[PDB]
């Protein structure tokens, strides 16, 4: 998986995908170099 971390939140970042499915319990959303970083705590 495309791992991404925001402080303490750990999740997955999507490549150029402006559509982050928040139904996966995503807590935060950060800008990762290659796309949208959707971070819950995985």
UniProtKB/Swiss-Prot annotation:
It comes from the Eukaryota. GO terms for molecular function: ion channel inhibitor activity; potassium channel regulator activity; sodium channel regulator activity; toxin activity. Changing residue 34 to A: Complete loss of ability to inhibit rASIC3 and hKv11.1/KCNH2/ERG1. The record marks 31-32 as: Interacts with ASIC3. Residues 13-14 are annotated as: Play an important role in the folding and structural integrity of APETx2. Changing residue 32 to A: 2.5-fold decrease in ability to inhibit rASIC3, probably due to alterations in the orientation of the side chains of neighboring residues of functional importance. No change in ability to inhibit hKv11.1/KCNH2/ERG1. This is Pi-actitoxin-Ael2b. It comes from Anthopleura elegantissima.
